[PDB]
């Protein structure tokens, strides 16, 4: 049985930790909602 619990407010944080790259990828989305990389 699934239940929910509050975890926080939705706000933008000034000076949050900044990370992650910005890749440009060719992808396909199938009928089951799964993404796959196209090459």
């Amino acid at each position: 049985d699934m239940y929910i619990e509050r975890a926080g407010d939705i706000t933008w944080e000034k000076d949050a930790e900044v990370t992650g790259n910005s890749p440009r990828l060719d992808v396909a989305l199938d009928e089951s909602g799964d993404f796959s990389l196209v090459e």
Binding site: G8, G20, G33, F35
Partner: protein, 156 residues
């Protein structure tokens, strides 16, 4: 149960102890999560029940108590924040510049941040605090790292 706007963990007592299967967004009395988190099953909030209202396996989205409310979109230029709610850990904002998923049907923003699968449903925000999509449906790249689409629904 609790209907205050905000980010929520989605839990189950089915497996060992209490397990976090995902996350979601409560906005305007509607709970928003990814389909693969709940598989469309009903949810409990205290002594209250949330019934599914709309869902789509292909978009990998589902809303409870009402129609999908989130309509903000990534502007294609600016940094965004993933409000990551990892299992057993405090909610944390991570700022990043999205990449892009190019498809035969158009382009979508993508965030290259890797968290446990039970973080699926965490919201991605713009600079005004608006939810531009949910994290947790994506791909694995050459290096074994994860890249998620910024998945957004349509407000009917």
């Amino acid at each position: 149960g609790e209907t205050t706007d905000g980010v929520y963990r989605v839990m189950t007592r089915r497996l060992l102890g209490s397990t976090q299967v995902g996350v979601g967004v409560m906005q305007e009395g509607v709970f928003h999560t990814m389909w693969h988190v709940t598989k469309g099953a009903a949810l409990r909030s205290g002594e209250g029940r949330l019934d599914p209202y709309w869902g789509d396996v292909k978009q990998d989205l589902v809303s409870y108590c009402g129609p999908w409310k989130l309509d903000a979109a990534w502007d294609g230029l600016s940094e965004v924040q993933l409000l990551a709610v990892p299992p057993g850990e405090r909610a944390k904002n991570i700022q990043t510049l999205p990449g892009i998923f190019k498809t035969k049907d158009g382009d979508i923003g993508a965030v290259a941040l890797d968290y446990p699968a039970g973080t699926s449903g965490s919201p991605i925000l713009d600079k005004c605090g608006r939810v531009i999509g949910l994290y947790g449906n994506g791909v694995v790249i050459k290096n074994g790292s994860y890249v998620s689409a910024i998945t957004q629904g349509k407000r009917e």
